[PDB]
Design a protein around this ligand. Structure first.
Ligand SMILES: Nc1ncnc2c1ncn2[C@@H]1O[C@H](COP(=O)(O)OP(=O)(O)OP(O)(O)=S)[C@@H](O)[C@H]1O
Ligand SMILES: Nc1ncnc2c1ncn2[C@@H]1O[C@H](COP(=O)(O)OP(=O)(O)OP(O)(O)=S)[C@@H](O)[C@H]1O
Ligand SMILES: Nc1ncnc2c1ncn2[C@@H]1O[C@H](COP(=O)(O)OP(=O)(O)OP(O)(O)=S)[C@@H](O)[C@H]1O
Ligand SMILES: Nc1ncnc2c1ncn2[C@@H]1O[C@H](COP(=O)(O)OP(=O)(O)OP(O)(O)=S)[C@@H](O)[C@H]1O
Ligand SMILES: Nc1ncnc2c1ncn2[C@@H]1O[C@H](COP(=O)(O)OP(=O)(O)OP(O)(O)=S)[C@@H](O)[C@H]1O
Lengths: 359, 70, 239, 227, 228, 219, 380
């Protein structure tokens, strides 16, 4: 019976939250402000309620401030509001929006969940207990006062499901996802690596609890590009900036970091020390049992003609991955809709096997 | 290898209007006068006649690498 | 010749190539072996055959004497070299002392060769790990394993190859003295251990035994099929 | 025509009927790779099919002019997707280690994980063995499409297309012209037509006869030994 | 960055020998104690598995009928040296009708503790404790990979040698007896080992002028352990 | 026309510059090396020429350059890449120094740590006239330097500098100053007021910068 | 319920009760003061070239407009209008009013620390001599200029640190930055790498501008290998801008009027590719190094990471330390946390010894193939 009184008083508090002369004061603030509100740029701040700004041409002025908005929302390199007639600081401007953010932040529910992963069951609980169970259930760690594991390296041969695992963590989540392929840290201008790194982790630390997933980072060392300045003596400095940004100073925060490689032996081991990355997880070519789950799930949504056996396909290649399985399970469908059919026969799989593997 | 020698002979034997252009002449001190000079050359070219433009050394212009900061 | 030292110590106290050549063993086929008290048994798993070809040349279990038996892991070529040298050594021992060659001698020879092989000038260490099962005088079954370091090291059951931790964990919860009471049960115990290992289709299950007063018998893969069938029958009888 | 059927089945079929794929329940494809000798139709096929299926053709290869039109030139290359979300039925196409890196970022986005569909990628290159093995994971590219050098009937069709703009003459044998070519490219027959026009022009004539074509064949086969 | 293996240091030592002195430290512990009644000695086996049959691991091996030994860390580099040391003691008793004293044994070993090279390969990786009873009474001897051989009255090696040397200098003096030193060693053992001390973990080796040969079969170890 | 210093990095070359500043009452003019490096193309030449002009109009003019190798770099003809503008500033320095329109009112002192970096036109023989090498302090000079830097500190007068100089092998003057100062602070560790010879010994042991790792088992 | 409904009633009673003052009382918190700031001035800032004689007669470059000859107003001091001084100048009559601090290049403003990360000296135990020496250099002259004056010495104005990675360098720096009391200024070594030639030089200039303005401050350099280590000279012209940045770092550090009340701490992982101009003392005096914690260090670091966690205190820690011969504190931290994570596999509230043994054979023996220090102990 607490619903009635609680709802009445809570709605009164919500209507008093909207209940916060007065219109005359709004008109006076509008009188102080000019109508063509010009935009400036801070350079420094002087503590006597007037500071230096910088116009769009370069002219700079010691101007006072119309102090009702929080001026302490502003730092060097900020955007202000200025007048034409006296150039005074009209007030704060909300921040410009947001090409790096909109590019590097995955906004949407991004694909299928753990119902699609093919029989791992042990790697999954490790990445679960490193990201999901810490973040979504932050109650066990209080009991033991143990900080969560920081970094997770996924590695293994190509085709095993690093990308799937990242997408599945990004499915069931509560944090902002940040995706940068590691090959975008090689720029044709000098000194552009550390700028990308500092902007990336600035975005991460300013926005939210987050997951920064950095994929195929091993290609930063074993791929020299002609579209570059002096290669290795800039790449090394970029790696050093990534290093210092990852485990440097000033209370790192609520940022999770997951990285994924093909090869691991060409990495500078200074990233691979603990304190930065605590979990290193192998992804092997699985077995001949969880392959049945992979063929099953990648044939779970199709009109499979039951004259085929999946054990004919398991035995076929001795070191096939889930990449090969997806490739055959889609190429057989491409052979199916080539001849206006619905169900898929055995020779479709035969042609798909002879198309994917041996070409 | 005799590059401008042939444009010289073409300027001699022709009847058409012939406009020589220094390559680096477009980039100048005042802002925006370059594209305006491009407009100038092409408006006069459209005006005159069946005509011939020779622009020497467009390596001053066509450089495949830029820097949109400077 | 090649005046160089391939294998250098680490800055933190290792031999890179001895500890690292164990990985080549770690990425080979699995093989177990136990001793009963009167019948010895061993066998390899994961032949990973093409199911449609010859199989008399891929035999991973051989013998050096009429008394001693082999198994290995890792890569097969170094095993071929070590087996050739071991055959020569055991027969040369028979040249001298008129006994049948003791198993402890041939394991010391293999481990000694392996260590002076790792020590020497520019020779790459042997990335294998053998199993040497034999029952010398007065019928005593014993079994030793090797290591790329060269440490002969007597066990009671085996744990090598791929996923040896799982297999030794099954042998850990399966150390029953009852299992080595019935020779047939010891054979079935190897079959159940290797069944708690890989596919174990009854195709790559190559096993050979010796009843210590005979030579090695390679079993025809229909008897192993009935062994797996009665193992599945006992597994149904567990419920 | 077979390559036409392939690109039909892989691009026109997702656009006009997504629910065929979603009824059969596989991944709708996202990648096409074109190979062959350079000069055999690597561009016209892609541009043409993208024109007929009503998709905004986009060819971003390597300029900085392009890097000013897309964004402000600041940091990366992914802002093409920001301009591609606004014209969602669109196709991205490229020429020949840089462009392969570009394709790596492109595919690494739209391999199931970037957006709603209607965005695809096409590379045209030559000599498949010169590219990355990490690109050659079989779960990465969906179709690989061959362009053979043209045959007698193929060059005949090419000639009967490119001859349709000239001032020809009756009683001309085109199959002789096609069967004097040493398996030329799809680019060079257009050169034969243009040089035939030039040879007719220098005679102060208005029609084009077979002599001009045969001398153009001689000219192009003389240019074939230039590098 | 791979330099030549026979390079000294910027500070002075070498490299590879120093890395050998580091490589000792991972090995199992051992404790030997000189007493005028005779030399006693102890070791830990470090049993890993129950499948691992325990009586086959050798730590105390036999050089002569009166010269004992114990090894550490790498097993098989030690096995070569043990074999060769035996051969050279047999050469001495043969060509001299007398017993090669323990110091002369260890001089013969550390003559080629460092002959590591590319012509005429790596340094060996074992620390050794040498005992026995020569004419100079009991002797306890300790060498290293660097050949820097010294006499020690009661040296403890390997992984737990810091607290072993410290707590050993706590309990040791000059006029100890045998059995007191035996239990004084195994107290230190079951303070420095990890597993429960029982019949299968450790093994002793004592050689006396009276108890003429080093002889130590099983289950007197049981009687010694139940005396704790 | 001009004097160059060069040598090992701790023999002291800033010292003579500050010395001649302390003694000669001309317009002594300092110039750091990379201060002639500019971002905008064509300001380093302006900077060099303005420096020489302000030297000329204050006619007794001693111009000091420190680390001339910052702008002094051996040129090269390559493609696709290459530093240019710094060589332009270097050529401006050369020509406004020597060549056309010579002068008698300029005095130039340069000092690099390494010699082989420079273009031969920088030195040629009339740009920087007197090549002056600096050696390491031999025996007595080390004792002289340590005796100089021990001046303000209260030395107990039972300290033989000869022992110190004969055991400080292959040091510079800066390392000798480091020896003396760290000896003072090692004496300040135990809190004793005036120094002792053992403090100097331990200061030498600290300046040598051993990296051990516990070497004890010798002899 | 009763607390919830009664707190809703009380808080909303205060809210709807002050609503009477909200609807009865009819920004202006500064409005009259801001309109008295309307007789104030726009005050454009400038830069001064020089003065003239017998009179003020000042000469100014504004920034872009022109250069004007001006006069001072009456509310100034005729002294502190020296050359190269950013002063605020009237827009109408062009007259100087107030001198100000110079240009600071605001991308350099954001590397002063402005906070204090909480790292105590207790977190680096087992490194007592290193803590002692670094204390002696950094802490003691800023808090006690007593022994250093009454005996007549100068403290070493520079200290470099090195060792294997993950050994405590960063952590010791933060431990100082807790109890610093000075203007601690962070510098990442990659901050001096910009697109344009000689730009990082100007960054170093502005660093020492800030350093000379504020007395008794600290500057921390971090991973100085990016700043520049060697002057490898070839017929290619490769790494050179970094080299000029390094030389400008040399000269404005120490030489020809030295630095003042500033102390520099550098920290590298590979102190071997360094030009010996940095190795000259007078710039980088004490070579404090971090080796591995030998035996008792790891016992103490187990006491550090174990003192505030749920364990079973009946176990020992020495046996845990005896299995970690070449290991860093980072690996110790991973051992402790991973033993906790094995306790999360079951549902317990206290660790076991077996949990720590799982942690040891999980971290050390398994990931010892990577292990980060078989090729940095040699300082490659
Ligand atoms: N274990 C698996 N179970 C099911 N499908 C799998 C599995 N592994 C891979 N796949 C398939 O492979 C695709 C994901 O590719 P990945 O294996 O993650 O490629 P990748 O090799 O990780 O690429 P990288 O990270 O650059 S090497 C999915 O669309 C699946 O169809
Ligand atoms: N037939 C000829 N072949 C070569 N040189 C000739 C010929 N006739 C005259 N010359 C002379 O050589 C010059 C040829 O060079 P140019 O015509 O200037 O070519 P170009 O302008 O120098 O090309 P550049 O060097 O790349 S800008 C002529 O200007 C004449 O002085
Ligand atoms: N199917 C065709 N039949 C006849 N001519 C063709 C055909 N396709 C292309 N051409 C002509 O040949 C030229 C070159 O063909 P493209 O389609 O551009 O291939 P491509 O651009 O040469 O491939 P590259 O050079 O490796 S990027 C075109 O500009 C057309 O004039
Ligand atoms: N007579 C002397 N000989 C050598 N060094 C001395 C002498 N007197 C003082 N010093 C020390 O020399 C130091 C100056 O060394 P530096 O000037 O740094 O070396 P350098 O000559 O400048 O080489 P750089 O730095 O490449 S220009 C001073 O700090 C003094 O402590
Ligand atoms: N001696 C130590 N005692 C206690 N904790 C330590 C010790 N060394 C390292 N740690 C812990 O491990 C972390 C890593 O040390 P850091 O100094 O941050 O590594 P680092 O200085 O970044 O090394 P790099 O990679 O060469 S910059 C520290 O922040 C501590 O949490």
């Amino acid at each position: 019976l607490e619903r009635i009184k609680d709802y009445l008083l809570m709605e009164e508090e919500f209507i008093r939250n909207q209940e916060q002369k007065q219109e005359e004061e709004r008109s006076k603030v509008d009188d102080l402000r000019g109508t063509p509100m010009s935009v400036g740029t801070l350079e420094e701040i002087i503590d006597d309620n007037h500071a230096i700004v910088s116009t769009s041409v370069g002219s700079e002025h010691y101007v006072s401030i119309l102090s009702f908005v929080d001026k302490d929302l502003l730092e060097p390199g900020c955007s202000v509001l200025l007048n034409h007639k006296v150039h005074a600081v009209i007030g704060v401007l909300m921040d410009d929006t947001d090409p790096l953010v909109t590019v590097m932040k995955v906004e949407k529910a991004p694909q299928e969940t753990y119902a699609d992963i093919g029989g791992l069951d042990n790697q999954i609980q490790e990445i679960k207990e490193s990201v999901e169970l810490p973040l979504t259930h932050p109650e066990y760690y209080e009991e033991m006062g143990i900080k969560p594991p920081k970094g997770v390296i996924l590695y293994g041969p190509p085709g095993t499901g690093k990308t799937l695992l990242a997408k599945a963590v990004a499915n069931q989540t509560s944090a902002t996802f940040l995706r940068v392929v590691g090959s975008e840290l090689i720029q044709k201008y000098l000194g552009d690596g550390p700028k990308l790194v500092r902007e990336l982790f600035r975005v991460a630390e300013e926005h939210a609890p987050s997951i920064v997933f950095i994929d195929e980072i091993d290609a930063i060392g074993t791929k020299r590009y002609d579209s570059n300045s002096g290669g290795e003596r800039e790449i090394q400095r970029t790696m050093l900036e990534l290093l210092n940004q990852l485990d440097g100073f000033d209370s790192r925060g609520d940022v999770k970091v997951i990285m994924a490689t093909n090869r691991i032996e060409t990495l500078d081991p200074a990233l691979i020390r603990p304190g930065r990355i605590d979990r290193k997880i192998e992804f092997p070519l699985p077995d001949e049992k969880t392959k049945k789950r992979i063929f099953q799930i990648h044939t779970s949504r199709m009109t499979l003609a039951d004259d085929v056996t999946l054990d004919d396909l398991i035995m076929a290649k001795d070191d096939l991955s889930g990449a090969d399985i997806k490739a055959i399970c889609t190429e057989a469908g491409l052979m199916a809709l080539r001849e206006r059919r619905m169900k898929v026969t055995n020779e479709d799989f035969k042609k798909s096997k002879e198309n994917v593997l041996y070409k | 290898c005799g590059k401008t020698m042939l444009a010289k002979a073409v300027a001699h034997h022709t009847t058409a209007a012939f406009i020589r252009v220094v390559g680096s002449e477009f980039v100048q001190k005042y802002l925006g006068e370059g594209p305006r000079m491009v407009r100038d050359v092409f408006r006069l070219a459209k005006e005159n006649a069946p005509a011939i433009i020779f622009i020497d050394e467009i390596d001053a212009i066509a450089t495949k690498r830029f820097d949109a900061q400077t | 010749s090649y005046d160089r030292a391939i294998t250098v110590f680490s800055p933190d106290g290792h031999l890179f190539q001895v500890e690292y050549a164990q990985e080549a063993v770690k990425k080979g086929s699995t093989a177990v072996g136990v001793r009963g008290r009167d019948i010895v048994v061993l066998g390899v798993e994961k032949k990973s055959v093409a199911k449609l070809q010859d199989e008399r040349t891929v035999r991973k279990i051989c013998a050096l004497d009429d008394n001693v038996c082999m198994a290995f892991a890792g890569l097969t070529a170094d095993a071929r070299i070590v087996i050739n040298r071991a055959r020569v050594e055991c027969q040369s021992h028979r040249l001298t002392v008129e006994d049948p060659v003791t198993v402890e001698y041939i394991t010391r020879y293999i481990a000694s060769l392996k260590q002076r092989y790792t020590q020497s000038n520019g020779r790459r260490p042997f990335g294998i790990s053998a199993l040497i099962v034999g029952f010398d005088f007065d019928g005593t079954p014993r079994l030793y394993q090797t290591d790329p370091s060269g440490t002969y090291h007597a066990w009671k059951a085996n744990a090598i190859g791929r996923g040896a931790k799982s297999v030794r964990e099954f042998l850990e919860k399966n150390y029953t003295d009852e299992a080595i009471e019935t020779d047939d049960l010891t054979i079935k115990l190897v079959i159940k251990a290797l069944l708690e290992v890989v596919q174990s289709g009854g195709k790559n299950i190559e096993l050979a035994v010796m009843r210590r007063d005979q030579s090695l018998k390679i079993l025809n893969p229909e008897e192993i099929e009935k062994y797996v069938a009665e193992i599945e029958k006992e597994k149904e009888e567990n419920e | 025509d077979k390559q036409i059927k392939e690109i039909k089945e892989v691009i026109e079929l997702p656009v006009k009927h997504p629910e065929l794929f979603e009824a059969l329940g596989i991944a709708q494809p996202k990648g096409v790779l074109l190979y062959g000798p350079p000069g055999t139709g690597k561009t016209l096929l892609a541009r043409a099919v993208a024109h007929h299926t009503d998709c905004t053709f986009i060819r971003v290869s390597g300029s900085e002019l392009v890097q000013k039109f897309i964004g402000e030139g600041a940091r990366m290359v992914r802002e093409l997707f920001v301009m591609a979300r606004e014209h969602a039925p669109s196709i991205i196409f490229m020429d020949e280690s840089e462009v392969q890196r570009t394709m790596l970022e492109l595919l690494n986005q739209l391999d199931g994980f970037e957006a709603t569909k209607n965005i695809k990628v096409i590379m045209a290159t030559n000599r498949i063995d010169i590219l990355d093995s990490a690109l050659l994971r079989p779960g990465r590219i969906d179709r690989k499409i061959e362009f053979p050098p043209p045959n007698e009937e193929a060059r005949l069709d090419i000639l009967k297309i490119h001859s349709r703009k000239m001032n020809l003459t009756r009683g001309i044998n085109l199959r002789k012209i096609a069967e004097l070519m040493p398996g030329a490219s799809g680019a060079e027959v257009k050169g034969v037509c243009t040089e035939a026009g030039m040879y007719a022009l220098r005679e102060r004539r208005v029609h084009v006869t077979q002599e001009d074509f045969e001398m153009a064949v001689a000219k192009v086969m003389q240019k074939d030994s230039e590098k | 960055y791979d330099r030549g293996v026979n390079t000294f240091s910027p500070e002075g030592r070498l490299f590879q020998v120093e890395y050998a002195i580091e490589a000792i430290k991972l090995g199992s512990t051992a404790i030997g104690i000189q007493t005028s009644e005779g030399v006693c000695l102890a070791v830990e086996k470090r049993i890993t598995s129950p499948l691992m049959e325990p009586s086959s691991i050798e730590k105390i091996v036999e050089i002569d009928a009166h010269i004992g030994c114990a090894m550490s860390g790498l097993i098989a580099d030690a096995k070569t040296l043990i074999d060769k040391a035996r051969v050279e003691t047999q050469n001495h008793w043969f060509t001299y009708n007398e017993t090669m004293t323990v110091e002369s044994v260890t001089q013969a070993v550390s003559n080629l503790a460092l002959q590591f090279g590319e012509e005429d390969s790596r340094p060996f990786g074992v620390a050794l404790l040498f005992g026995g009873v020569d004419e100079k009474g009991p002797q306890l001897f300790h060498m290293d990979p660097s050949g820097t051989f010294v006499q020690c009255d009661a040296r403890a090696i390997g992984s737990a040698s810091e607290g072993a040397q410290s707590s050993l200098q706590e309990v040791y003096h000059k006029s100890m007896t045998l059995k007191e030193a035996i239990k004084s060693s195994l107290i230190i053992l079951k303070q420095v080992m990890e597993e429960k001390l029982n019949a299968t973990n450790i093994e002793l080796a004592t050689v006396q002028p009276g108890q003429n040969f080093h002889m130590f079969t099983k289950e007197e170890l049981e009687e010694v352990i139940k005396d704790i | 026309k001009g004097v160059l210093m060069y040598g090992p990095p701790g023999t002291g070359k800033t010292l003579l510059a500050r010395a001649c500043a302390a003694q000669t009452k001309a317009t002594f003019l300092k110039l750091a090396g990379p201060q002639l490096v500019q971002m905008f193309i064509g300001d380093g030449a302006k900077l060099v020429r303005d420096a020489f002009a302000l030297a000329k109009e204050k006619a007794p003019s001693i111009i000091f350059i420190d680390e001339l190798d910052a702008i002094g770099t051996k040129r090269f003809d390559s493609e696709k890449a290459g530093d240019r503008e710094v060589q332009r500033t270097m050529l401006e320095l050369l020509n406004q120094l020597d060549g056309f329109q010579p002068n008698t009112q300029v005095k130039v002192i340069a000092a690099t740590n390494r010699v082989d970096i420079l273009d031969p036109a920088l030195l040629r023989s009339g740009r920087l006239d007197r090549k002056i090498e600096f050696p390491m302090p031999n025996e007595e000079a080390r004792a002289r330097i340590m005796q100089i830097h021990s001046r303000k500190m209260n030395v107990s007068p039972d300290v033989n500098y000869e022992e110190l100089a004969r055991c400080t092998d292959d040091f510079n003057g800066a390392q000798c100053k480091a020896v003396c100062v760290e000896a003072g602070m090692i004496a300040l560790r135990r809190g004793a007021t005036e120094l002792t010879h053992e403090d100097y010994m331990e200061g030498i042991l600290e300046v040598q910068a051993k990296k051990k790792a516990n070497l004890q088992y010798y002899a | 319920q009763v607390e919830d409904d009664i707190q809703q009633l009380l808080k909303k009673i205060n809210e709807l009760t002050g609503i009477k003052e909200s609807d009865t009382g009819l920004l202006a918190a500064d409005k009259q003061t801001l309109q008295s700031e309307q007789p104030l001035q726009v005050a454009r800032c400038t830069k001064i070239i020089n003065a003239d004689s017998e009179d003020p007669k000042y000469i100014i470059n504004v920034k872009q407009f022109a250069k004007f000859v001006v006069d001072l107003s009456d509310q100034v001091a005729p002294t502190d209008i020296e050359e190269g001084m950013r002063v605020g100048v009237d827009r109408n009559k062009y007259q100087i009013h107030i001198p100000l601090p110079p240009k600071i290049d605001p991308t350099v403003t954001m590397m002063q620390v402005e906070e204090k990360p909480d790292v105590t000296y207790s977190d680096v135990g087992g490194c007592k001599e290193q803590i002692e020496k670094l204390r002696e250099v950094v802490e003691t002259p800023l808090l006690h200029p007593e022994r250093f004056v009454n005996l007549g010495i100068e403290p070493p104005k520079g200290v470099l640190l090195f060792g294997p990675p993950g050994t405590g360098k960063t952590l010791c720096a933060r431990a100082v930055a807790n109890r610093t009391d000075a203007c601690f200024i962070r510098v990442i070594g990659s901050e001096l790498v910009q697109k344009y030639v000689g730009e990082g030089a100007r960054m170093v200039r502005e660093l020492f501008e800030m350093a000379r303005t504020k007395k008794a401050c600290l500057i921390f350099f971090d991973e100085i290998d990016a700043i520049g280590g060697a002057r490898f000279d070839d017929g290619a012209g490769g790494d050179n801008e970094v080299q000029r940045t390094m030389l400008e770092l040399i000269n404005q550090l120490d030489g020809f009027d030295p630095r003042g009340n500033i102390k520099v701490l550098m920290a590298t992982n590979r102190p071997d590719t360094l030009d010996p101009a940095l190795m000259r003392p007078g710039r980088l005096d004490r070579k404090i190094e971090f080796s591995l914690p030998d035996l008792e260090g790891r016992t103490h670091i187990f006491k550090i990471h174990a003192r505030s966690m749920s364990v079973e205190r009946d176990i020992r820690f020495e046996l845990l330390a005896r299995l970690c011969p070449n290991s860093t504190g980072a690996e110790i931290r991973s051992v402790c946390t991973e033993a906790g994570m094995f306790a999360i596999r079951a549902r317990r509230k206290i660790a076991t010894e077996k949990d720590f043994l799982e942690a040891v054979n999980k971290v050390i023996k398994s990931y010892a193939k990577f292990s980060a220090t078989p090729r940095y102990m040699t300082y490659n």
